[PDB]
Amino acid sequence: EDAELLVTVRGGRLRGIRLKTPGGPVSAFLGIPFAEPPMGPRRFLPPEPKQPWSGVVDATTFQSVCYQYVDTLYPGFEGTEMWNPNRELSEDCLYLNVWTPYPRPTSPTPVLVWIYGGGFYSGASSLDVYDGRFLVQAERTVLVSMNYRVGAFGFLALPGSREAPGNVGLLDQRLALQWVQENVAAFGGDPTSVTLFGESAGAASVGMHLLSPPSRGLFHRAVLQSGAPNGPWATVGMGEARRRATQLAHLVGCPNDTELVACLRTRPAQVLVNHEWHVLPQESVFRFSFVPVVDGDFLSDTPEALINAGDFHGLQVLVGVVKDEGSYFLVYGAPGFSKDNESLISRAEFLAGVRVGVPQVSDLAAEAVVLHYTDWLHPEDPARLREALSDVVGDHNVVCPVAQLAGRLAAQGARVYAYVFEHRASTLSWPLWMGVPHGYEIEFIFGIPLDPSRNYTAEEKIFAQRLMRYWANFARTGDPNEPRDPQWPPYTAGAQQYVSLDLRPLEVRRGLRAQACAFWNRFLPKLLSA
Amino acid sequence: EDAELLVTVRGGRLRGIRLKTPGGPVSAFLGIPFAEPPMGPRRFLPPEPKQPWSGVVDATTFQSVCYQYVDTLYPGFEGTEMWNPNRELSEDCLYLNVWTPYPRPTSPTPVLVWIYGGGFYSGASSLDVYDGRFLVQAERTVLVSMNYRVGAFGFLALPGSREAPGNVGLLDQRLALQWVQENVAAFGGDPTSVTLFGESAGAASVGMHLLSPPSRGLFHRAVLQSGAPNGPWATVGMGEARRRATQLAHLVGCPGGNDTELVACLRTRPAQVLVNHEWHVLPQESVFRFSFVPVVDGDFLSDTPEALINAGDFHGLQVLVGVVKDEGSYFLVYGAPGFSKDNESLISRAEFLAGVRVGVPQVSDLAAEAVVLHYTDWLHPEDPARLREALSDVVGDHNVVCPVAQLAGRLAAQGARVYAYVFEHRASTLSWPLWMGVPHGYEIEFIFGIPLDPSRNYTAEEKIFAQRLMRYWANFARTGDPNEPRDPQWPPYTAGAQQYVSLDLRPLEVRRGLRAQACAFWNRFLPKLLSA
């Protein structure tokens, strides 16, 4: 028996497994229960801490994936399948995973906590693309990831009710973070040096923990990749949340909040999933049914209000986007789009696509969008229209919410570093017109190209090693920079400097789409108020 | 008694004068009466045709300038003085001028009819810069200019009333155009080939004759320089005109309306008294806004110039339209905070923001925010030089470039043959500061061939340039196409390709889009925003 893979946490004893990497072994503890299973009467309720167990919990394999919609747009396609559940679905899914150097670090080591994205309706910590082994070996940090409830299970809210208070997926994340505070030293991690990082809804989650004081005491630094808590998709108001919960109930044959939730609780999980999409107020891309609700509890105000009121001295943040944030989402509902052709759309499809990509705004707002994203010298050029609709979707949903976060945080005392990730993976299976799509930096941050069984180039491996080093540096010191030789300067509201990440050395640039983002962040809200 | 200087028109006999030009002799008939003097009881009334006279009228010199405000912003400064009245002010000012080749043409010759600008509040056909002698000599056309009433005398309107119906200044123009139809042939001109041209308010006037059926039969082709009838300043609505007239009346002690009594009281006021109060009736401090301008009342204009343009069929119409390179700059020294001809006018962000409200007067705060959004460079939001340029563009785009672009675009899409230019030469003799670039009004002197005047000190290159432009304008008047037999060709402007040419010392260069991005904002979006 190997003593290095036996660990005692507050709940009791665990047995881990030794994992191989090209750089040597790593210790992993996978499928550690951190909450009582949120099933039956516990569905929709805040997570309860896992009760202590006797004997040895087997932590050598990933646990179940939280019940969720499975994408079927392109059956068998790697582009989509890599994001689908790779373990059986279950409501008993509240487990977390710890990776640590082998042998276990005898002294306190910086801790990275990963929060996966997936629109708050999907995701899992067990996806290949999130394999923590390479980061931990190369950069000698402790790495933790958790599962959290998604979809109706994590975010159905009847606000004001005790039966479905909403935001429980976020509380799942908070519980995992408290778990880390209490137990991570037992794996050689330093609880006073926790960096949170996440992508998409993951990044939005990180941002929400930053703005929620009970969470804020649980970690030190933050990395938000291609996402922000101030997106137009990441939060919903109490009224709309109630409307969606009620309509879901109706669709699954349920009729008083108490009675409504009790009926929902009798329904097989798969039945809620089957109707989740149908509660959205319109056809759209980049909108999801059950998301964090602003109800004055977890978030005492909108993330944007909180961001402007905050003193952020003492916080360091790393934020960034990929070169083509919008392209991926277009094939999920914009007319004329497909991964299987050039998606060269007409003006009419462009005009219709705007209503789909910027849902639930007035006709006047839509016209303003059309005004800004139309090149009036070439108003009908199919290729330019394709790019422009991708920009609309990406700017509105990711880039401009990230720029605002970065600008406001910097202006209020945080030290911010910003990047644009510009390398298109040689292994990318999505078409060339999509460019560097959303989500495709993650495999580089996790050092996936170091896996020999995959088909990445020699240059891509070196690049991955550079990225792991920036991220780990940031986790350790609050500054991604290596000792002098081209330096990554902090992002400020004035100079607006960021760097491009790809195979060539850092290049410093100015403005995260400053012109477009003035439109979304400064003007459009005024227009919507009137 | 020289026979070439004697002409009989319908009203009676005329004696003219022989002008010397650095090319040869030209015949000029200056100061021909075309209406009864609109004085006394005739103030504010539509012009009456001049009654026939016995004997010979000496048309040997420019007649009086129509009563008008005289600019005093920079006293003694050439750049402003050149636009000021150079004859005495009078309400008796309804005269026109004809220049014809010497000797008089023997076959019907194309006629160019000039309508001066001056914001509908000033201007005169007698200005040195409008001297028609060089055009006539160089291009062998007949040239005609008229005076029309300006300010209150031409545009004060109490809509519905017969004592001050409004638009009388435009009716002065129409009457002169009718005079051309009736009499131009006696000077050797072809009344079937009349080309109207004008600049600024003159260009807006031209556009309005295009959109008013009674005027439309009096000419054949049109040239609009740096102005359009659809500009936010060229017309006012019926209520706003009434408010302004009523306020002026109040300011000069005129009791607040039986309209007959009120106008009769106004008629007793010395001309200068009305002029002294003209500017103080405007709703707010601004640039590029004029108290008394054409009114949309159903009569002269049956609808707004915007609607008339969208609704019209313009097949068979040839138009030439253009702007100078820096339309806004000149106007900024007239009220925009931080601007002067005497310093760099390197304004702060705060001055920029305040200047936007001055330059885009009487729109909602939201509309103003939209303007700031589009004209701010968000990587350099506070750079003084960029801010100065940006405000100039705001004013120039909103008042001139975008209204011209809309006009050109719609006219083309609806059957007109349209040619568009951007004038890019800054005169060697320009007295305005370098930062103003090529300002509004400064192409005119080249179109009229002023550089060929010996007493002036233009470079030889500018004289060659002037000759090129005169040739383009005359070619257009003769054939509806500014082009010469092939060599660099000026292609037509169309809504899609949006092609225009740069005019300056180098050969024609073809370009696309009259500030297409800006103008989409002003022409397509802003109107929708204002309806909400």
Tab-separated table of N, CA, C and O in Angstrom, chain A residues 364-365 367-369 371-372 374-379 493-496 510-512 514-515 518-519 522-523 526-527 530, chain B residues 366-367 369-371 373-374 376-381 495-498 512-514 516-517 520-521 524-525 528-529 532:
chain	number	residue	atom	x	y	z
A	364	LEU	N	-35.602	49.756	-32.031
A	364	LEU	CA	-34.651	50.863	-32.096
A	364	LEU	C	-33.241	50.398	-31.712
A	364	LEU	O	-32.266	50.714	-32.395
A	365	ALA	N	-33.142	49.617	-30.641
A	365	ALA	CA	-31.854	49.079	-30.217
A	365	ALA	C	-31.240	48.209	-31.314
A	365	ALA	O	-30.049	48.323	-31.621
A	367	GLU	N	-31.759	48.383	-34.563
A	367	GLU	CA	-31.299	49.273	-35.632
A	367	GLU	C	-29.950	49.895	-35.303
A	367	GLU	O	-29.081	50.014	-36.169
A	368	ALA	N	-29.776	50.302	-34.049
A	368	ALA	CA	-28.496	50.848	-33.615
A	368	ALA	C	-27.407	49.800	-33.825
A	368	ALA	O	-26.307	50.118	-34.282
A	369	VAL	N	-27.711	48.549	-33.487
A	369	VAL	CA	-26.736	47.492	-33.687
A	369	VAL	C	-26.395	47.375	-35.167
A	369	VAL	O	-25.227	47.352	-35.540
A	371	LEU	N	-26.701	49.585	-37.449
A	371	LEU	CA	-25.943	50.769	-37.830
A	371	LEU	C	-24.449	50.566	-37.575
A	371	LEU	O	-23.621	50.826	-38.445
A	372	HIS	N	-24.106	50.085	-36.389
A	372	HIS	CA	-22.699	50.006	-36.013
A	372	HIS	C	-21.934	48.873	-36.678
A	372	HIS	O	-20.747	49.003	-36.942
A	374	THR	N	-22.701	47.494	-39.630
A	374	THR	CA	-22.779	47.534	-41.083
A	374	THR	C	-21.637	48.387	-41.616
A	374	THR	O	-21.375	49.477	-41.098
A	375	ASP	N	-20.946	47.876	-42.634
A	375	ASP	CA	-20.001	48.680	-43.397
A	375	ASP	C	-20.797	49.266	-44.554
A	375	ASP	O	-21.099	48.569	-45.523
A	376	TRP	N	-21.129	50.550	-44.461
A	376	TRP	CA	-22.025	51.161	-45.433
A	376	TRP	C	-21.408	51.373	-46.820
A	376	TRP	O	-22.088	51.832	-47.753
A	377	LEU	N	-20.130	51.034	-46.956
A	377	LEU	CA	-19.514	50.954	-48.286
A	377	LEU	C	-19.724	49.575	-48.920
A	377	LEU	O	-19.653	49.428	-50.141
A	378	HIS	N	-19.978	48.576	-48.073
A	378	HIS	CA	-20.158	47.188	-48.500
A	378	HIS	C	-21.293	46.543	-47.710
A	378	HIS	O	-21.086	45.516	-47.070
A	379	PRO	N	-22.497	47.137	-47.759
A	379	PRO	CA	-23.583	46.720	-46.864
A	379	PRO	C	-24.091	45.293	-47.094
A	379	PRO	O	-24.758	44.756	-46.206
A	493	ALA	N	-7.795	51.692	-17.432
A	493	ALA	CA	-8.939	52.261	-18.143
A	493	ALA	C	-8.492	53.247	-19.227
A	493	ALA	O	-9.099	53.321	-20.297
A	494	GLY	N	-7.419	53.983	-18.955
A	494	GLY	CA	-6.840	54.886	-19.943
A	494	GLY	C	-6.098	54.192	-21.085
A	494	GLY	O	-6.601	54.129	-22.210
A	495	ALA	N	-4.906	53.666	-20.802
A	495	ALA	CA	-4.054	53.076	-21.842
A	495	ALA	C	-4.637	51.798	-22.476
A	495	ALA	O	-4.355	51.490	-23.641
A	496	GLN	N	-5.434	51.063	-21.701
A	496	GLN	CA	-6.146	49.873	-22.181
A	496	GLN	C	-5.241	48.832	-22.843
A	496	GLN	O	-5.608	48.219	-23.851
A	510	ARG	N	-3.432	48.052	-27.723
A	510	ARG	CA	-4.344	48.956	-27.006
A	510	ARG	C	-5.803	48.768	-27.417
A	510	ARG	O	-6.120	48.715	-28.606
A	511	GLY	N	-6.689	48.685	-26.430
A	511	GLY	CA	-8.119	48.663	-26.688
A	511	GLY	C	-8.745	47.301	-26.939
A	511	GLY	O	-8.486	46.653	-27.956
A	512	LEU	N	-9.581	46.869	-26.005
A	512	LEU	CA	-10.387	45.686	-26.222
A	512	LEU	C	-11.627	46.131	-26.984
A	512	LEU	O	-12.688	46.368	-26.376
A	514	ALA	N	-12.423	48.980	-28.337
A	514	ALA	CA	-12.879	50.196	-27.665
A	514	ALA	C	-14.093	50.853	-28.312
A	514	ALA	O	-15.018	51.274	-27.612
A	515	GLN	N	-14.103	50.938	-29.636
A	515	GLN	CA	-15.220	51.585	-30.311
A	515	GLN	C	-16.506	50.783	-30.116
A	515	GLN	O	-17.511	51.315	-29.652
A	518	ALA	N	-17.716	50.918	-26.432
A	518	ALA	CA	-18.323	52.176	-26.014
A	518	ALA	C	-19.808	52.084	-26.330
A	518	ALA	O	-20.662	52.520	-25.546
A	519	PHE	N	-20.112	51.488	-27.477
A	519	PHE	CA	-21.503	51.318	-27.891
A	519	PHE	C	-22.317	50.466	-26.900
A	519	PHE	O	-23.335	50.927	-26.385
A	522	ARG	N	-21.533	51.925	-22.919
A	522	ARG	CA	-21.856	53.311	-22.569
A	522	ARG	C	-23.182	53.812	-23.148
A	522	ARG	O	-24.008	54.354	-22.429
A	523	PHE	N	-23.385	53.638	-24.447
A	523	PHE	CA	-24.575	54.189	-25.092
A	523	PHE	C	-25.838	53.329	-24.971
A	523	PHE	O	-26.886	53.821	-24.576
A	526	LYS	N	-28.219	53.579	-21.976
A	526	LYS	CA	-28.990	54.829	-22.014
A	526	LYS	C	-30.178	54.728	-22.966
A	526	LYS	O	-31.289	55.128	-22.636
A	527	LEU	N	-29.931	54.163	-24.140
A	527	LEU	CA	-30.971	53.978	-25.141
A	527	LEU	C	-32.085	53.071	-24.635
A	527	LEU	O	-33.266	53.337	-24.862
A	530	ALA	N	-34.673	54.538	-22.278
A	530	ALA	CA	-35.631	55.418	-22.938
A	530	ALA	C	-36.261	54.788	-24.191
A	530	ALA	O	-36.895	53.726	-24.141
B	366	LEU	N	-30.292	62.204	-25.237
B	366	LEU	CA	-29.925	60.891	-25.776
B	366	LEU	C	-29.270	61.033	-27.156
B	366	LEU	O	-28.204	60.463	-27.415
B	367	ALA	N	-29.901	61.818	-28.027
B	367	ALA	CA	-29.359	62.088	-29.358
B	367	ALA	C	-27.947	62.661	-29.250
B	367	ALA	O	-27.027	62.225	-29.950
B	369	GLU	N	-25.861	62.211	-26.838
B	369	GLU	CA	-24.990	61.139	-26.364
B	369	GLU	C	-24.587	60.259	-27.534
B	369	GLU	O	-23.446	59.805	-27.619
B	370	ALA	N	-25.534	60.021	-28.439
B	370	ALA	CA	-25.250	59.255	-29.645
B	370	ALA	C	-24.174	59.953	-30.489
B	370	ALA	O	-23.235	59.311	-30.980
B	371	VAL	N	-24.305	61.267	-30.647
B	371	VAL	CA	-23.300	62.023	-31.378
B	371	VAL	C	-21.920	61.862	-30.730
B	371	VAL	O	-20.939	61.594	-31.412
B	373	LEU	N	-20.834	59.523	-28.877
B	373	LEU	CA	-20.397	58.135	-29.044
B	373	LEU	C	-19.705	57.943	-30.382
B	373	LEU	O	-18.633	57.356	-30.450
B	374	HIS	N	-20.327	58.453	-31.436
B	374	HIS	CA	-19.808	58.272	-32.781
B	374	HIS	C	-18.563	59.106	-33.071
B	374	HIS	O	-17.687	58.672	-33.814
B	376	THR	N	-16.381	60.361	-30.771
B	376	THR	CA	-15.286	60.164	-29.827
B	376	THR	C	-14.415	59.008	-30.317
B	376	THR	O	-14.935	57.992	-30.777
B	377	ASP	N	-13.101	59.175	-30.265
B	377	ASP	CA	-12.194	58.044	-30.446
B	377	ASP	C	-11.883	57.526	-29.051
B	377	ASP	O	-11.204	58.204	-28.274
B	378	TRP	N	-12.365	56.327	-28.732
B	378	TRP	CA	-12.296	55.839	-27.354
B	378	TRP	C	-10.923	55.336	-26.910
B	378	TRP	O	-10.736	54.958	-25.750
B	379	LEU	N	-9.963	55.368	-27.831
B	379	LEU	CA	-8.560	55.183	-27.466
B	379	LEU	C	-7.877	56.516	-27.176
B	379	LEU	O	-6.786	56.547	-26.608
B	380	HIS	N	-8.505	57.617	-27.586
B	380	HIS	CA	-7.925	58.945	-27.372
B	380	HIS	C	-9.040	59.936	-27.041
B	380	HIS	O	-9.169	60.962	-27.701
B	381	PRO	N	-9.846	59.631	-26.008
B	381	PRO	CA	-11.073	60.409	-25.773
B	381	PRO	C	-10.818	61.869	-25.414
B	381	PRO	O	-11.742	62.684	-25.554
B	495	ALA	N	-26.073	55.214	-55.610
B	495	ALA	CA	-26.335	54.839	-54.223
B	495	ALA	C	-25.441	53.681	-53.756
B	495	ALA	O	-25.039	53.626	-52.593
B	496	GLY	N	-25.112	52.778	-54.671
B	496	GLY	CA	-24.274	51.639	-54.338
B	496	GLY	C	-22.786	51.949	-54.341
B	496	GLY	O	-22.143	51.913	-53.293
B	497	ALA	N	-22.231	52.248	-55.515
B	497	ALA	CA	-20.791	52.501	-55.622
B	497	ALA	C	-20.366	53.822	-54.952
B	497	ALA	O	-19.228	53.943	-54.490
B	498	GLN	N	-21.276	54.798	-54.907
B	498	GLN	CA	-21.042	56.064	-54.199
B	498	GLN	C	-19.719	56.721	-54.599
B	498	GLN	O	-18.955	57.189	-53.745
B	512	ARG	N	-14.685	56.444	-53.036
B	512	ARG	CA	-15.985	55.888	-52.678
B	512	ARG	C	-16.497	56.371	-51.327
B	512	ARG	O	-15.773	56.339	-50.329
B	513	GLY	N	-17.759	56.790	-51.293
B	513	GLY	CA	-18.424	57.073	-50.034
B	513	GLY	C	-18.201	58.477	-49.510
B	513	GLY	O	-17.075	58.859	-49.161
B	514	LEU	N	-19.282	59.247	-49.454
B	514	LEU	CA	-19.255	60.571	-48.853
B	514	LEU	C	-19.476	60.436	-47.332
B	514	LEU	O	-20.614	60.570	-46.848
B	516	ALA	N	-19.572	57.774	-45.576
B	516	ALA	CA	-20.652	56.794	-45.528
B	516	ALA	C	-21.023	56.334	-44.116
B	516	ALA	O	-22.211	56.264	-43.785
B	517	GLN	N	-20.030	56.054	-43.277
B	517	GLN	CA	-20.325	55.628	-41.902
B	517	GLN	C	-21.022	56.727	-41.094
B	517	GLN	O	-22.069	56.486	-40.488
B	520	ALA	N	-24.636	57.408	-42.433
B	520	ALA	CA	-25.610	56.384	-42.065
B	520	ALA	C	-26.197	56.751	-40.698
B	520	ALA	O	-27.411	56.652	-40.472
B	521	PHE	N	-25.329	57.186	-39.792
B	521	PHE	CA	-25.780	57.665	-38.489
B	521	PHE	C	-26.732	58.862	-38.625
B	521	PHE	O	-27.830	58.843	-38.078
B	524	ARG	N	-29.792	57.682	-41.511
B	524	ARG	CA	-30.590	56.475	-41.302
B	524	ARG	C	-30.999	56.245	-39.848
B	524	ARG	O	-32.124	55.865	-39.585
B	525	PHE	N	-30.088	56.464	-38.906
B	525	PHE	CA	-30.383	56.144	-37.506
B	525	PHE	C	-30.979	57.284	-36.675
B	525	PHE	O	-32.018	57.102	-36.042
B	528	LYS	N	-34.695	57.953	-36.590
B	528	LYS	CA	-35.427	56.921	-35.852
B	528	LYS	C	-35.331	57.132	-34.354
B	528	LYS	O	-36.290	56.906	-33.618
B	529	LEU	N	-34.162	57.566	-33.906
B	529	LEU	CA	-33.957	57.836	-32.492
B	529	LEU	C	-34.800	59.027	-32.034
B	529	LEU	O	-35.339	59.020	-30.929
B	532	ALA	N	-38.476	58.872	-30.951
B	532	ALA	CA	-38.663	58.125	-29.706
B	532	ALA	C	-37.816	58.672	-28.550
B	532	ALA	O	-37.972	59.823	-28.126
